[PDB]
Amino acid sequence: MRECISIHVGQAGVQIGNACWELYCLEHGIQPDGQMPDDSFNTFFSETGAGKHVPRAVFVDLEPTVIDEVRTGTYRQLFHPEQLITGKEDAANNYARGHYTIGKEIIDLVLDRIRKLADQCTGLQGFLVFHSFGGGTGSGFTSLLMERLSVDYGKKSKLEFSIYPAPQVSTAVVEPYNSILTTHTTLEHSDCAFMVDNEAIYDICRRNLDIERPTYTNLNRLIGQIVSSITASLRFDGALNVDLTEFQTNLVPYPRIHFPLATYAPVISAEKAYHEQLSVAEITNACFEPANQMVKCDPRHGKYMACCLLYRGDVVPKDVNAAIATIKTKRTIQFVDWCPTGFKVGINYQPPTVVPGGDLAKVQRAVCMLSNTTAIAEAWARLDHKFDLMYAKRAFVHWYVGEGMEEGEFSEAREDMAALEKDYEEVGVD
Amino acid sequence: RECISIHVGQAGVQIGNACWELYCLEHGIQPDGQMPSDDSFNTFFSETGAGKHVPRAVFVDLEPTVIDEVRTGTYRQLFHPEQLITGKEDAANNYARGHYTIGKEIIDLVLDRIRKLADQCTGLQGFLVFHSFGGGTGSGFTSLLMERLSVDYGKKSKLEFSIYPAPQVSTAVVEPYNSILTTHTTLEHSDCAFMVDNEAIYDICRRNLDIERPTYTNLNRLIGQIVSSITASLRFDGALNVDLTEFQTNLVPYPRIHFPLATYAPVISAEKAYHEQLSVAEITNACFEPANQMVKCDPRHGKYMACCLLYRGDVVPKDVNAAIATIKTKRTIQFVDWCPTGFKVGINYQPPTVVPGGDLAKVQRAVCMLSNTTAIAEAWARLDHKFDLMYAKRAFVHWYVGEGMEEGEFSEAREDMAALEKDYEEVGV
Amino acid sequence: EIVHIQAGQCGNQIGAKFWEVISDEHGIDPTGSYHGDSDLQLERINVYYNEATGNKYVPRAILVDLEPGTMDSVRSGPFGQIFRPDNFVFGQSGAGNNWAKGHYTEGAELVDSVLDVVRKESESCDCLQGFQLTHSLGGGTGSGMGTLLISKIREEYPDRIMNTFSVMPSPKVSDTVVEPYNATLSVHQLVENTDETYSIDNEALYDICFRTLKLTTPTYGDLNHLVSATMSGVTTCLRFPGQLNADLRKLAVNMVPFPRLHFFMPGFAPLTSRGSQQYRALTVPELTQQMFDSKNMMAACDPRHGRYLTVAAVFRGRMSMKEVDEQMLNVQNKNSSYFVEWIPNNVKTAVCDIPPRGLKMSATFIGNSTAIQELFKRISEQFTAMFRRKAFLHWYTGEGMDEMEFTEAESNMNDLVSEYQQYQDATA
Amino acid sequence: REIVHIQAGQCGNQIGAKFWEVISDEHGIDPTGSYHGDSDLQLERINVYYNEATGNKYVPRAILVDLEPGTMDSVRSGPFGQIFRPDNFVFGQSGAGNNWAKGHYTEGAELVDSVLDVVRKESESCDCLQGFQLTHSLGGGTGSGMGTLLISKIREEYPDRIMNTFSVMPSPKVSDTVVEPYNATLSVHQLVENTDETYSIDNEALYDICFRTLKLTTPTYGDLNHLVSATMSGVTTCLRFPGQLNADLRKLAVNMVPFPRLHFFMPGFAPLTSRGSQQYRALTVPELTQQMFDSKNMMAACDPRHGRYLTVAAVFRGRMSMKEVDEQMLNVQNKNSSYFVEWIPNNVKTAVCDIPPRGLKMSATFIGNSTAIQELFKRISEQFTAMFRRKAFLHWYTGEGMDEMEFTEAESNMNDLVSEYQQYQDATAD
Amino acid sequence: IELNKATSGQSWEVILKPPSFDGVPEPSLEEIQKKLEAAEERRKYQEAELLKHLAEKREHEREVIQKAIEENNNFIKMAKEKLAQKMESNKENREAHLAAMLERLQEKDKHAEEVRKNKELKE
Ligand SMILES: CC[C@H](C)[C@@H]([C@@H](CC(=O)N1CCC[C@H]1[C@H](OC)[C@@H](C)C(=O)N[C@@H](Cc1ccccc1)C(=O)O)OC)N(C)C(=O)[C@@H](NC(=O)[C@]1(C)CCCN1)C(C)C
Ligand SMILES: Nc1nc2c(ncn2[C@@H]2O[C@H](COP(=O)(O)OP(=O)(O)OP(=O)(O)O)[C@@H](O)[C@H]2O)c(=O)[nH]1
Ligand SMILES: Nc1nc2c(ncn2[C@@H]2O[C@H](COP(=O)(O)OP(=O)(O)OP(=O)(O)O)[C@@H](O)[C@H]2O)c(=O)[nH]1
Ligand SMILES: COc1cc2c(c(OC)c1OC)-c1ccc(OC)c(=O)cc1[C@@H](NC(C)=O)CC2
Ligand SMILES: Nc1nc2c(ncn2[C@@H]2O[C@H](COP(=O)(O)OP(=O)(O)O)[C@@H](O)[C@H]2O)c(=O)[nH]1
Ligand SMILES: Nc1nc2c(ncn2[C@@H]2O[C@H](COP(=O)(O)OP(=O)(O)O)[C@@H](O)[C@H]2O)c(=O)[nH]1
Ligand SMILES: [Mg+2]
Ligand SMILES: [Mg+2]
């Protein structure tokens, strides 16, 4: 029961998923053969006759390279050759290819593995879509698939893990186009989306894992840690609390207003030694420093429409309440009038498991604070500006147009953003 | 000469258990029915082919428990399975439920057990109806019964034994509603109604009997003693009150004022050191002090229209009239213009019987009194204001109208209950 | 005879606490066998328990949930073995704190199935009194399905009486933003469908645990320990033989003066601590005035803000009705402004000579006070915050509903407060 | 994933042969065609420019085309000569004779269909054909004429494939063929219309480098051709060698080309070297970064500082500190901010290969879309308009079929491109 | 004064002051049932009217669970229908671009012929 399928959309999407799935195998002491030496983890994996626990997931990419790395990699047997879908012709960092031209030549096959994974689902909760914002595949293909599941699986829970572009971490001049194009098309077909601004991920490694030049892994190993903290409340039935979907109810006030901000803590490198350790009250306040945020924004200026604390490890209400007590005096946590000033707190048993030969050190007590602040519309503002600049001159546009796309789709997709931008304005009115 | 004692609702049913307990004691009947070695006791006992004397009494309740406590008691053998009629759910403190709801259902069957109790009669005088006032059953059904009994037994008597409610006793918030709607319906029908103010019986079991928190049993031990003192002349070969229609004449002069005030002496305890027993002069003076009165309403301020002094045991007429002459000397004791200042005295020489192993005391001498006084309006006016407050704001009404009643029935009953109080004015001039 | 349904996370945990406290009072050991000392217990044991003949006992309890979780807690629980297996009626798709899920879409799917158990369990009884529903007012299974089930039952058994132990939500206990929506929607259904409703404010239970019981971290076990006391406390009259001799409908007739005004303010004296320490007993005056004072109410209102229409009070333990009655007449004479003069003898006492578990005295209270409108304004206000801006409505409109149902459900509760008022001001 | 190569005319074959010599050595391949390299990264993306054969031998995927056996034979009797499939050599005996009309229309066309027969063969045996690559003289007959004739015909057959050219712009400083600006302008007309990207190898810069810098008094072709290939290994670095990216002609095109006509790149390389001279004193990181945005190092005689960069891609080769690189890369753009279009956010992108070129410990390539490239087109228009004014040498073309208006057609189309380049140079955000 | 004497009883009047005034003054079965049958009519109807308001509610739920069933299906129409338009507009569009580019090329391949013609016309 309570099943959920994870769908990975090229490069960012695939690579992230691997960091996730490797951590999952560790979390539930699973070996890279599907075998393992609570039953709540069966919401993500599935046991066969031989006792093989295959994940309820799909790895998709328009070109082979990234998925081939999985097909030969350290976990080659952890999946099905069918559940690992690939093309040949890449999305050429173009949404118009990802969505239309190239995308159409796989979608049907893709949706089928989803349907075959959907069959073994006693009671499907929904889907988790790990994609890039600026990648041709991550953008175009994702929206096509998201539109198609809103058809096939109708009003079913479509959750996302979007990878917000950062110049520091790769990028490609067009990315903001692909970003705004997908943001728009996905909006109606999404339920709740978790953005991950690659700069804030970069910044963190640099500052805490003390990595001057963060590798993709270095970032993903960290990202997977934050994502797992979100999905902890699903693969674990810990009496303590652990309760996603309940969070989502406070988190999503209105439907377009579905972008919670993640503020993971504590990110500590395996080097500290006699630092042991942070109190609940320390890590609580950690979530309030914009330096720990998943997306770079400022909610000290920003209003609030939800605050949700997801604890994991050595947590006792006594001090969480004592923690929430102090914070509730810090006159920067200003909520809207129509919104209550409460904090939905969930606690897990299983503390954060750390990757063998990793950058981070085994924390006793980890947290992740999801919140619905109007300060997120800064990410949109950041992206919309770069879009405007190139669009002004209709720079690179011809590549999109050349793949079918009407010149109006870009404007439509921009006004929709402008609306969402204004929607966060309106909601913040007291 | 025959007599059907009907007991409707828990109070009257429980009260009937203490009545026939004393009756079978006074006549020597065993809890099985036999009585080994005047015959007037038969006015209440229908002897079977197996020589046993089964009472002429039909017990009625809308819920099982109480009548089921009879088929438990030692006196289970005493009655037939047909005479103890029980429903499944009582008229939950609701008159309209007792009358129109569960009433309509059980009426015919209740009347049948009466018919067949009466299909044994050489001369059925009337019926001795026993009940509460504030009960759902002891108001809704009783009033419905008198209604059909009056048609089915026209020109035959009705002697209401009603228990007036009291706060110091287990009373309910709806009681004053039931109490009026019942009286309105049980007025044109009842020929004589003996009120038992639960308030007085309460402290009488205390001040004179030394029991601070009196049980229903202790309260009834006293009620049965006063009830049997009323029926004494009917159950025996006595002179005064030889029939049902005797009280109806000797006490009821004006018809609507069919509520005589009762009085009883000697109220005496057992767990106290023995001494000289009370004399005729002792009890007669005790009979005129409200410290032993049945219903709490000032006799000293209220015009009379009747009086009967019903003695029992070791008495002699000279000493009776010697104790009568003592009171007329200093106390003038009022009477209406249209009435003779004098009482019909009666002595049933039989011994005053008390329950063996009871709180009461075995006295050789006793008395009772039946007195129609205008002061009994002071009892209604109490209940009338209680009704007056709630009905104004229509508090609880919805329960009654929910049971098929009409909102007018409360005003109808209160108009008549006021009319009756103007009749206590028109008389007590 | 009585049928006891328990709906939702709250209602089931609440229900299993009652079913364990009353089974200790009745000698029904976790397995299902009478072992109690006096047969005074056994007398009115048919009200709640059946016979496996046996001679085992089964509670007249139907269990409802739209997800397994809590059913299993009971199964795993000590007194869980005692429950009829064929009585656990549960779904898999959790209703998730949505009244519209429990009341419409999800609930409907399990309703018919549950109703069959009540149809069956109602057959076993010679003459049933009515029904008892224990549930949360801010959830979805409890809040929505419970009210759905009530409407369904009312239709099936119109002559039977609907009694509920309805737990009012609060922001002090539960962070679920949506709560004033479910609460209002469910209040609206109670105002029109139940005959007597026991108002259990979580605000007040958390406040009791905190200020009064000195419990720094109040857990549900502590908040629920207070409820089981007030349940076995008000159900002393149904389970225990004495001069009462009463039923659900007799209570309802006497407590409820006007139809809609049927929400009750439960009270308890002494407010004991879950565990420690039981030492030092109470005097009669101590037990009376505590119980009448706002600090001892399971509902968060001020009795001194309104006027009681009717009052009920079950004093337990060995004492003297003289002492007890002497204090009741003292109170009504002292605080005469807060008892409606137009309902003669508006306060009823009841004394049982059996104390509860541990404590050698108790005094459970129920008051039909006009002051409860405070508990309703509390919710109606919390609702509007969200409502004026139509916040979190999408979850409900998605379920099939319309804003009209919210407009109506509030307007109906605003009319209740408008009504509770009418009488608070009224005089002879 | 597979690039088909075509060399046209003298220069075409001359530059092509050297490219092939450079990249075979770079990949560890002998003149025969058998691998010998130590690192197996050489064999990684070999599938691109090479064909797998019998005896595990490799053969460059290239079509050798000219209308004269001349250079064709010089190639065969050259260093690698035997490595090429002789069936691919499509060599007429006509001789276009530095005449565009002889190549594009008449003498060329007859051979064009024979050429295509070979392209259609090389395209067939392909897992995924990426696009085509042309190396040609813009001033000659066969290179500029038949070369652009070939483009247009290939462009018909495969519109879905990337068209890439290495177009060597003539210089009066390197040639006395008076008609050269005629053949130049006509070829540019075709290029602005049917190639995805074009690397502008200008014979003026090639000379001045070999003369003023390399100090070789009388520079030979060998002296020039060497610099051509230095930039050609450089441009094709990540297309051949592995790295972080991914490695697509299309991805580059989409990122590098904002407007479709404007796709002429200013190739630059550092360190500049004299053909076959052993290097000694290695370069620091800022030397390579500074010496790469130097007009002095640009393969096209235009001043980057005279215009504005729309897009830039800088490929550094051989093991070095990326922080030192990122530090410097950002110094350059943050200092010379005036020469970068504000309306193309994040216009500079850097790639690093650990594998360096033979004889170099550190190299760095530059690809740029600077508007400054107009200085090249302008130069040619004047050169053309000088002669056209006076209908000079024109009868060579008319008598070859060719119409008079076709010249004025190409001249004004070139004049449009100039204005077009300036339009965006001027254009600001505000 | 005297009244009666008996076996186990005796009675007698006892006057004191007689009356100052010599004078004194100053049910159907059908209509029982007629009242009871009107009373039941009442009780039975308001409980029957209640059943109408409950049946009214049962219909709202019947309509609500229905709105939700349509609300998702009308949405799947919009989603499926939009996707159908988008893939078509795009198939149409991308194909017009590809077709017009080869038309331009074919026309430019036409020129080539009239040129080798203008060469033979000159010859
Ligand atoms: C104000 C009410 C809260 C939500 C409680 C409570 C939850 C609870 O009672 N829970 C949730 C699991 C079970 C239970 C307790 O902690 C293990 C145990 C001892 C218990 O009482 N168990 C029950 C079993 C049970 C009851 C109800 C439902 C399910 C199971 C029993 O003894 O019978 O935590 C203790 N609380 C103080 C808290 O501190 C929680 N904090 C919050 O929600 C705050 C800070 C307070 C309200 C506004 N936000 C959170 C940090 C856990
Ligand atoms: N955090 C993170 N970002 C990544 C990762 N891989 C790529 N990205 C980001 O993804 C964006 C580029 O999109 P891609 O996902 O690489 O492209 P794609 O079209 O989906 O995939 P391809 O088919 O390989 O082109 C940039 O913002 C990158 O920084 C990764 O593993 N981690
Ligand atoms: N003295 C006395 N009064 C009684 C007794 N039982 C009940 N009452 C009174 O009767 C009144 C209530 O009427 P009930 O007849 O008991 O109630 P009911 O609704 O008619 O009958 P049930 O519901 O079946 O018990 C109150 O005034 C009680 O004080 C009893 O045995 N003795
Ligand atoms: C099933 O339990 C009970 C049932 C009832 C009563 C009650 O309180 C003592 C109960 O205990 C909680 C009751 C209540 C209120 C009254 O007036 C407010 C009344 O007059 C009268 C009563 C009850 N009657 C008496 C004499 O207590 C009858 C109904
Ligand atoms: N006092 C009390 N409140 C509870 C309990 N469990 C949950 N709650 C309350 O119940 C409400 C949520 O409804 P709940 O019954 O948990 O969910 P449901 O399964 O949808 O009925 C909130 O107001 C909670 O504070 C419990 O056992 N006791
Ligand atoms: N850099 C360079 N330029 C050359 C080479 N061969 C010819 N050129 C130039 O090419 C132009 C003439 O083209 P050419 O290759 O001779 O004619 P084709 O044989 O008809 O393609 C002139 O501007 C020459 O400078 C060469 O090998 N290298
Ligand atoms: Mg891509
Ligand atoms: Mg009754």
Q: Which two tokens stand for residue C42?
A: 């056994």
Chain B adjacent subunits, 3+ CB pairs under 8 A:
C, E
Kindly state whether residues B45 and B126 are assigned to the same domain.
yes
Cα–Cα distance list, B291 to B264, B295, B379 (Å): 10, 10, 16
Give the up-direction half-sphere exposure of residue E107: CA atoms within 13 A in the CB hemisphere. 6
d(CA D120, CA D132): 12
- What CATH number is associated with residue B409? 1.10.287.600
What strands lie across the sheet with C308-316, from one edge to the other? Answer: C347-351, C308-316, C362-369
Q: Do B333 and B251 lie in a common domain?
A: no
CA distance B181 to chain C (A): 17
DSSP letters along C40-92, please?
HHHHT-TTTEEE-SSS-EEESEEEEESSSHHHHHHHHSGGGTTS-GGGEEE-S
Strand A304-312, strand D3-8: pairing:
unpaired
Structure solved via: X-ray
CATH topology of domain C1-257: Rossmann fold (3.40.50)
A378 is catalytic: no
Cross-strand pairs, B59: B7, B84
User: Ligand 6 centroid to A336 CA: how many Å?
Assistant: 73
Chain C: nearest CA to E83, how far in angstroms?
23
Q: What is the CATH number of domain E27-123?
A: 6.10.280.30
Rounded to whole angstroms, the Cα distance separating D130 from D2 reads 5
B146, B105 contact by CB (below 8 A): no
Residues A113, A61 within the same domain: yes
Answer whether the bond into residue C55 is a cis peptide, omega within 30°.
yes
Q: Binding residue per annotation — C96?
A: yes
Tally of domains within chain A: 3
| Cβ contact, residue pair E83, A147, below 8 Å | yes
Domain covering D1-258, topology: Rossmann fold (3.40.50)
Pair D9, D143: CB distance under 8 Å: yes
Whether residue B102 sits in one domain with residue B170: yes
Q: CA torsion angle for A25, A27, A29, A32 (degrees, to 10)? A: 10
Verify whether the Cβ–Cβ distance E64 to C151 is below 8 Å: no
Residues of A310-331 as b/e, b for ≥16 C-beta within 10 angstroms? bbbbebebeebebbbeebeeee
> How many angstroms separate the most distant Cα atoms in chain C?
61
Chain E residues with CB under 8 Å of B314 CB are none
Q: Within its chain, how far is the Cα of D147 from the centroid?
A: 13
| Helix B137-152 vs helix B102-118: crossing angle, to nearest 10 | 50
What residue in D sits closest to E110 (Cα-Cα)? D105
- Angle made by CA atoms B145, B151, B154, in degrees to the nearest 5: 115
**DSSP 8-state class, residue B276:** P
Which chain A residue lies closest to E83 (C-alpha atoms)?
A147
- What are the domain boundaries of chain E? 27-123
Annotate D127-147 with b (16+ C-beta within 10 A) or e (fewer): eebbbbbbbbbbbbbbbbbbb
Q: Are B151 and B230 found together in one domain?
A: yes
Give the DSSP H/E element, type plus range, for residue A414: helix A407-427
The residues facing A132 across adjacent strands are A163
Residue C146 near residue C8 (C-beta atoms within 8 A) = yes
Chain A residues close to D311, C-beta within 8 Å: 173
Query: From the candidates A147, A199, A246, A282, which is the catalytic residue?
Result: A246
To test ligand 3's pocket by mutation, which of B10, B84, B179, B216 has the most ligand atoms within 8 angstroms of CB? Answer: B10
Looking at the DSSP bridge assignments, the partners of residue B119 are none
Q: Is A15 in the pocket of ligand 2 (CB under 6 A)?
A: yes
d(CA C13, CA C75): 12
ω into B322 cis (within 30 of 0): no
Confirm or deny that B321 is annotated as ligand binding.
Answer: no
CATH 1.10.287.600 residue spans of chain D: 373-430
Distance from CA of C108 to the nearest CA of E (A): 9
- Identify which of A367, A213, A187 has the alpha carbon closest to the alpha carbon of residue A289: A367
Pick the CATH number of C258-371 from 3.40.50.720, 3.40.50.2300, 3.40.190.10, 3.30.1330.20: 3.30.1330.20
Task: Report d(CA C364, CA C371) in Å as an integer.
Answer: 19
Angle at the Cα of C42 (from C37 to C47), degrees rounded to 5? Answer: 145
Chains D and B touch (3+ CB pairs under 8 A): no
The rounded distance, in Å, linking the Cα atoms of D318 and D358 is 10
- Please list every residue in chain B whose beta carbon sits closer than 8 Å to the beta carbon of residue E31: none
Q: Render A359-388 in DSSP notation, one character per residue.
A: SB---SSBEEEEEEEGGGHHHHHHHHHHHH
Shared-domain flag, residues A323 and A403: no
Q: Which of C126, C250, C259 sits opposite B88 (nearest CB)?
A: C126
Give C136 Cα–ligand 5 centroid separation in angstroms.
5
> Is there a contact between E64 and C104 if contact means CB atoms under 8 Å apart?
yes
Question: In angstroms, rounded to a whole number, what is the distance separating the alpha carbons of residues B214 and B205?
Answer: 6
Q: Is the CB of residue C111 below 6 angstroms from any atom belonging to ligand 1?
A: no
Domain of residue B31 covers: 1-260
Domain end call among B375, B393, B411: B375
Q: Which tokens sit at D49?
A: 């420019």
- Assign residue A358 the CATH number of its domain: 3.30.1330.20
Neighbours of D24 (CB within 10 A): 21
Question: Contact at 8 Å (CB) between D103 and D144?
Answer: yes
What are the Cα distances from residue C40, in Å, to C3, C30, C37, C315, C356?
Answer: 22, 20, 9, 18, 14
Instruction: Specify whether A132 is located in the same domain as A281.
Output: no
Tell me: do B174 and B154 sit in the same domain. Answer: yes
Structure tokens at E17: 């002051």
Mark yes or no for CB contact D152/E108 under 8 Å: yes
CATH number for the domain running over C372-428: 1.10.287.600
CA distances from D31 to D58, D61, D75 (A): 10, 15, 12
Distances (CA, A) of D345 to A387, A390, C375, D429: 9, 8, 58, 11
Pairs of residues, one from chain A and one from chain C, whose beta carbons lie less than 8 Å apart: 53
Token code pair at residue B101:
């709801």
Architecture of domain D259-372: 2-Layer Sandwich (3.30)
**CATH superfamily entry for domain D373-430:** Helix hairpin bin (1.10.287.600)
Q: Which amino acid is at A280?
A: V
Cα-to-chain-centroid distance, residue D393 = 28
- The resolution in angstroms reads 3.5
Kindly state the greatest CA–CA separation across chain A.
61
d(CA C300, CA C361): 24
Give the contacts of B270 (CB within 8 A, at least 6 positions apart).
Answer: B358, B359, B360, B361
Ligand 5 atom with minimal separation from the C139 CA:
13
Residue B294's closest CA among B242, B356, B236, B371? B371
* Cβ proximity of A172 and A93 under 8 Å: yes
Task: Find residue A370's DSSP bridge partners.
Answer: A262, A308
Every domain of chain C with CATH number 1.10.287.600 lies at: 372-428
Pocket of ligand 6 from Cβ distances under 6 Å = D 8-12, 14-15, 96, 98, 137, 139-143, 168, 170, 174-175, 180, 203, 206, 221, 224-225, 228
Closest C-alpha residue for ligand 3 atom 3: B11
Specify whether A219 is located in the same domain as A289.
no
The shortest CB-CB distance from E54 to any of C148, C155, C159 is to C155
Q: Which CATH number goes with the domain that contains A87?
A: 3.40.50.1440
Q: Which helix (H) or strand (E) holds B163?
A: strand B157-164
Same domain assignment for residues B132 and B39: yes
